[PDB]
Structures are given as structure tokens and as C-alpha cells.
Amino acid sequence: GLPWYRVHTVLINDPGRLIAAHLMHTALVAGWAGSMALYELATFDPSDPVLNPMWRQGMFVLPFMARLGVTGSWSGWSITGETGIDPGFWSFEGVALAHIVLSGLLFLAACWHWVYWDLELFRDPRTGEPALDLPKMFGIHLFLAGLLCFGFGAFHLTGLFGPGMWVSDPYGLTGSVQPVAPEWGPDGFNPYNPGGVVAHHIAAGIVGIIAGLFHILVRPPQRLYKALRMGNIETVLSSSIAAVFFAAFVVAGTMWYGSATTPIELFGPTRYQWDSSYFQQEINRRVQASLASGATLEEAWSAIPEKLAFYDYIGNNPAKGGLFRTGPMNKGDGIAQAWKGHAVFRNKEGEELFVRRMPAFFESFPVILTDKNGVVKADIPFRRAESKYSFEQQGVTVSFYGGELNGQTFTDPPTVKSYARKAIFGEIFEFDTETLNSDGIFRTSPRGWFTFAHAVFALLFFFGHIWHGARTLFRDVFSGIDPELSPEQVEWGFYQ
Amino acid sequence: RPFSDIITSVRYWVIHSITIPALFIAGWLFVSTGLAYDVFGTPRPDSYYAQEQRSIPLVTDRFEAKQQVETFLEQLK
């Protein structure tokens, strides 16, 4: 009989049943997308996108719809920040209903192809055996892919008959979907420039049209055919797993390292922005610029938006998070409600001391306060009977500027220790912990889940390539009978 | 030829009994006159620190790495 891991070795010499099987898988994937979209929509909350963005609520498929031009809801809410818009038929709900409808159609069409599996076309007209024309098939399908690549670039991305794509400013304060004209210079291979992406699609769709025309008019060389074993449908399978796992690594990498297509208002900040101190420098730059032109500390720190400060907090770093910790990042330390403000610590003589930032490598990190010339001047000791610096011996105080607490000052140790213990995380925020009953342990953002998954899959798909290539080059060794012979008929001997 | 009578031939003797010491002595002289410390940039056995400061060298840039480490080498750091 057939082993349990060999139950699709019957479609191999069966074009009709194979088309039907592929149709079933397409139907399941489309069904999945639609139903996942509805699930996430029923459990979403766009009332406050500035102190609870969509990647904090843990939306997975919702950013992907927002990148290419869905931005509304038939309820009427917007994720731009707007209230009261009509996106027409095409809202998040609209595309979900579309996908469910297409899964149904595909399911019917699969059933048909499995019933009517034997037709003149699928059989060789010379012997009644399954015949494929694998080069011509690649050419035609390539021409279709090229036609689509060109259309997607020239009409949708440049917004000549489409919505365009998500464009941003480098610090994620305001982004929106807009028309983008291409860039053919040497500045179009800069992945931080959307014009490069459009030029790629325009150009590559044109190359695809040309290669697709090529591959219809030209038959493979004799040497490459009999070397690479063409006409065997299991050749196409090894090759396609290879391309696919290459493509997996590149998407995982560009999601982890960032790109113009993976902005920070759809999937939150990267780890590489925390560890370079990107936002801390932005925030300092602004405060120094206002004090220079003429300001006081209260005015200068009140000129920092809540959006900036929320990005500069290690809780959003996607390198914080466990493996079996589940649930949105809001389940991680609570829902942000307001920005307490930037803290400034001083000791008893009156200089400013600064709290050291915790790195993502460390799961727990001591609270150290060092001055501006790199000599430690206070800490919260681990000792419970020995001190040489402490929050009593140095009389450490904290004042707040900006946010909610503005002009506040706390003197006695314990509440100051509490704020130092928050300050190792950067900024300080008021969280509401009662609506999810958060456990105060972090979780990763959607950027992390995407990368993790696709790296695992790419690595597994590498083994797939090796096994299926083995089965192509060694068909006559795994089998008994070389496919260079016809079925065997009359036996001659030789005996003494 | 096989490696079962390869060091029994008169060829082995006549050449190797002179080339072996030559390149061995070359390998000795390479270290003995201290050329290795200048080729791979190894620091001398008492030039790990300057006398100017007692900090260890670490290059904190990648495109000015060259002149940074040249600056460290200037003071014998």
C-alpha cells in the first residue's frame, strides 16, 4: 500500500487532479485571509491611535491592508486619526467580504476539475499519457506575471489609476498613502526611498514581458534538457522551493532591518533604532534648539510631542519579548494613557545626574546614576547594610518637566527610587493595567513575529530543496526502471 | 608516484636535505628579528599601553577606523 507520508504521489501523472488540488489550497488561503481580517476587526479599537497604535493592539493583517491604500471603515472610523469619512466600497470590511466570496468560487471550480479530470488536452495525442510542455508553460506564465508587474507599478504605485503607497517622514510623526513617481538615478536602489520601489516595478515588469515573449518562441537546448532532467514536473518543484526560501530570507531581513515598505507606523520601531539612540537624539535636539532661541525648561519640554516620547521607550523594542508569552504588547505592561513627562534627577549639591539606559540583552539591569563626565555618583544599591553612594547619602531628588507632572519635585527616597526604576526604560508613561490585567512582562511586536516565523520556514524549505533535487537527479536510482526505455515487451534469452 | 616508497628515492635526499633547513631558518628569522610584530600589527611585549593614559584601545568608528588606530599607535598605545 501507500505510506501515510506518500498520499499525494497519485497526482504526479494526473494533470486534472493536480489543478484541482492546487485550486483547493488557493481557496483555503483566501478563506484564511478573509476570516482573519474579520476576526481582527471585531477586536480592534481606533479611538486613540497616538497612545495606542495598531501594532500595540497586535494587528497582523490590518497593517498590510493599510500599506496599499485601505484607510477607512464602513463604521466611519479612520486610522489616520480622522473621524467621519466614507472610503467607498473598499474598507477593511470590504476586502474581507471579497476574499470570502473568492474562496467559495475557487472551491466550486476545484470540485469541477476533479470530476472532469480526463480530457483531450491533458493527454499526449500520440499515446494517451500525461504530457506537459514545461518550457512553453513557463513562458506564458512569465508573460502574465510581467503584465501584472507593469500594471501594478505604473497605475497603482504612481497613482495614475490607483491610491499609491504609504509615505512617511523619518520619525513617523505623520504618514499617509500618496502618489509616488519613480527614481531611475543611483538613488533608486536606496531602500529608504519609495521612488526606487516604483522604478523597480516598472522596469522589472517590462523585463518580464520580454522574457515571457522569449520563452514562448525558443525550445530548450539538447544538453541542458537531458542534464537538468526537463519534462519532469518534480524539477519545477525543487527550483520553486529554492526561489521561495531565498525570497523568505530577504523579506525577514528587510522587516528586521526596516525599509520604506516596512515603516514604523505600521509595525512599530526596530531594535536598530533604540540601540543607535535615534529618538533620544531627536528629542534632545528639539529641547536644545528651543532653549537656545529663548525658552525655559517648562516651555522647552512641553514642545516635545507625546508621539516622540512614546517611541523612545524600550517596551516597544521588538527584541523585548519571550517565546511563549502571548497576547498584544498592551498585555505586556498595560495600555498607555498619558505621558508623565521627562524626568530630571539631581543629587544634594545640585548637579544633574542621568540614569543609564538598559540594553535589550539584559533582562534585569542595575539602577546607576552617573554624571556627564562618566563617573558614577549615585545608585540604588543591592546591599541591605552597605552603602558608599545611596539615595539618602546623596539626597537624590527628581523633578519633572513636561507631560503631566510639570514643575513637580519629589524629595524623599522611595518615590524617587520608583522613578529611577522606570527611567532605565527611557521615558515614563502612565499605564492602565486594569483593562487587560497585564502581568508586567513584555511581549514582542508584529515585526518580531513575522521575522521569527519566516526565518524558521526559510530554513526548513532549504531542506526541502535538497530532498527534491535528490529525487530529480536520481530518479532511476530511487526507482528500478530508467525512463529512457519504453515498457518492456517480449523476452529473449540466451542459454547453453 | 605512491607514498609507499616516496621518501626512499635519491630525489628526496638531494633536494630536501637543503631546502628544509633554508625555509625553516627563514621561519625562525621572521620572529627572531621581530618582523611579525609589524606585518600583522602585533604590539610589542611592552607597548600594550602608552605612558599618556592607561586605557585600552577600542575603535569606535568603522570609516575612520584607520586613522583612529593610527592615532593609538602614534603614542605607543
Binding site: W256, D439, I466 | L58
Partner: protein
Amino acid sequence: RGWFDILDDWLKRDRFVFVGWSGILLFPCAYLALGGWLTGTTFVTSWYTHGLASSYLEGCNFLTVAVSTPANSMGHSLLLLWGPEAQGDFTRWCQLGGLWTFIALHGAFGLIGFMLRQFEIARLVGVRPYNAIAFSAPIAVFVSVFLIYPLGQSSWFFAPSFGVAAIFRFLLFFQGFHNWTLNPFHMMGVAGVLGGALLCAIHGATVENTLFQDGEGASTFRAFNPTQAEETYSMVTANRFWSQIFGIAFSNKRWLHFFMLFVPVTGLWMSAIGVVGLALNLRSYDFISQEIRAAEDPEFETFYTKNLLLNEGIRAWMAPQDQPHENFVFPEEVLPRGNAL
């Protein structure tokens, strides 16, 4: 015949060492990979990338030398000799940890050449190439740890270095910052590798003591070396033995020899999946329920809670010199200690 055909049949002569198309990728890359390790663990310093010494010319012995990693500021740089960091200077190139990459990348393509060599050799003799497939477990391990893992970290500085003490260090490092023993995928790696060693010992012993030709002189005249054995013992005496000792035995020689192949390989593959997961610092570090229960009742104490304290210790006392580019200074009153609890 054309020149191509003449080249092809020159490469596939019967000779002591097989060159082959695969040889062209394997042999130069392997030579340069291996030789770079040697020339570097004898001469090249790391006073400029870590603040250490790691070569013989400086003082060190066989266990404490290494070719070490780049500095943290270099990013994920290729570290080309013609790149914009060395600028064509072999000294700076050695000084910046540039040849760790040389070794690593040349060894990676040497791996690729070896597996191709196994394919076309096995193609020549016309046997199934399972050993080429087995050999993709070592490739999985190599690329997930030495290439993918620091590409999820911020630099190659957090990659392991080629050396004995450097990788002993990697062991203690992972123990401290990831608590890697408590990760189910490494547990599945341990089960697989130990099970491989188990099958190895049991099979050797069983076969060596069910030999045919224990009485009258050998009625076996071949090997026929490529058969390995399997002719030289009786399946029935071993199967009958192990059905009474352990209560289950194999009765099919082919499936026994397939199990021996499956076990270590699935083993390595699973631990690879786990460590590519650590590359985005997603860690099965703690059981959430145990932490809550320990917070609310502080007389609760577990062998697990001890391991967490110990790892806190590893991190805190090892960090400043293992990450001397961060400039950690810990006053001794902030470090953790047993007598302070």
C-alpha cells in the same frame, strides 16, 4: 569531442583524490578557510577589537588562542580587504578582525562544495545519496549560529570566535543571557544527540557478539568493502535477545539503519530552529505562573528560581569585560551576592 568534454573527463579520472566540478569550489575555499584560522591563531592580535591577546606570538597556549571577532562599531560589515575600512592595508585588515569573516565565509562555501562533492560522487557510483542529506544537519547548525544569529544581533561582535576558550565562553554567555538549557528546542537537540550515541554503542556491541563463523574457519570470503558489514552477523539471534531483555526489538535491518540516520539529524535541525529563534531575542526564559506565585508568597523557592539567581550573577559579573565597548562600571555595592539576600 569539444574542449568541454575533455575537461569533464579529465576531472573524473580514477585517482587517489577526486577533483570533480565540486572540487573547484571545495578545495581553494577549504584551504584558505583552514589556513586563515592557522595564520591568525598564530600571529593576529585582538588588542584592538576586544582588548585581549589571543595568539602564540603574544603568549598563549593551544586552548587559549583564537581568531576573534570584529569590534561592535563595524556593524554587519563584510570587511573586504579593498573595502572602505581597510583600504588595501593588510595590517589594519588583521587589526580590525577582518579575517574572522574571511575564515567564516570561505568555510561556508567550503561546506557547500563538500555536499556537492558527495552528490556527484554518489551519482558516479549510482547509489542513493542519503549521506549528502545527512550532511545538511551540520550546514543547518553552521549557518544558524555563525551567520544568522549575529545578523539578528547588532553586530558580528556577538558571533562566536574560532577557538577553544572563545567557544567555552559562548557556552557560559548563552547560559547567562538566554537561559538556553530551559528551551525545549535545545532539549530536543540533547535528546537527539544522546540517542545517537546510544544507538551507536548498542549496535556495535550487538553486532560484534552475534558474529557468524565463531566455530569453524571463515565461510565468508568477501567483503566487498562497500557493503560495510551486516552479512557478518545473524539478525535472528540479536532480535531474539532484545525481545526478552527490553521487550521490543527491530525485526527489519533496513529500518534499524534508517532510525540511526534519522535520530541525530532531526536532533540538529530542531536545535537550529531554536537558536534562529534566539536571534530575535525571543526567549523561553521564565514561566509566568511561577513568577507570579513567587512574587505573592516569597517563601516559595524552586530549583528554577535558583537558576535565575545564578544567571543574574553570570550576567552581572561577566558583562564589563565581555562588553568592554559599552563601558560598564558597576560599583561593588550594586553587584549581586549571596550574603546580601
